[PDB]
């Protein structure tokens, strides 16, 4: 329990679970909505994957 001749500065970090609030002005961003088409991926032997 005897001090050495050299000190230290213990750095560390802390994770904090915050609740953010998102605000934006009206008509900020124009976008285009596509056509929601379906597709057929894979024919596994008893089950197909769309």
């Amino acid at each position: 329990k005897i001090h050495p001749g050299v000190a230290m500065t213990v750095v560390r970090t802390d994770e904090i679970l915050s609740e953010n609030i998102l605000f934006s002005s009206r008509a900020s961003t124009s976008m285009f909505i596509g056509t929601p088409n379906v597709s057929r991926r894979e024919a596994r032997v008893d089950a197909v994957t769309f």
Partner: protein
Amino acid sequence: RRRLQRRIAGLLPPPARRLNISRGSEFTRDVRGLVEEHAQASSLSAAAVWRAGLLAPGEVAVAWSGWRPPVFGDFLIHASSFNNAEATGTPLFQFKQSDPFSGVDAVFTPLSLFILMNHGRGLTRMANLLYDSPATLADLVPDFGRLVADRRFHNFITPVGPLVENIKSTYLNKITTVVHGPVVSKAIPRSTVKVTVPQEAFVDLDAWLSQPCPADARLYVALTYEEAGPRFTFFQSSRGHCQIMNILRIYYSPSIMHRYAVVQPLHIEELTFGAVACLGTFSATDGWRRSAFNYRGSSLPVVEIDSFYSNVSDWEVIL
């Protein structure tokens, strides 16, 4: 030359790949025509057969689709060499009999194939419960001990894949197994079939290692030669065959020097430490859901590889 236009009209349309649907509750005829895959079993009327379209050449079409029709190899075995309480989805193994004109083959499920190994030296409780006498199975192979003793047992058994239908005959049982293709049952309610392998005989090789995930993780069988009687283990992996031989050598690294320490290899044929064979592929995501298997008395833990695609290969020796 206008009839060629009608011929190219009858030949053009592929299966529908894209479909710009609008809403879900409407259920348009076009999305139904995309999702309607034709059946295989229907009632017996010529209009019903015509709507079912089973008369179409090769693949089914109402007067190619990335789907394969399954083949169904047929076998004949004696009634005592098999238990009718076997599961539907279980892989099978043919042993080639030594008679030149045979007719009646000899098929071993891994539960039955266990008692060809234990007699001569849980899971073994059920294997002795179902097939009660080993003597009714010790004779289908004529010379088992000599064939283990020179280590040419693996090139005599070719895997035939999973079982489908067992018409429980009286004396000469006829079973149907899928050697190749989409494993699906021939029932009038066409129910799904899941290939089962008993849990203690089946060690995962993925979580045995404890980012690239493909869709088709294969299932490997492996017969291994032990001085404590040979063993049939099964393997699930998402690797190539090049990877499967190296990681199986690293997995069997205790057993090889175990056999080396107990039995010195006096001749030149004992050095073969068993072999492997791809039994086929399945879905890598929904794989190997556990389940339970009851006989009248007991219950062994058992895995269920669901919606399996059978594809047998030859034997590649482990060393």
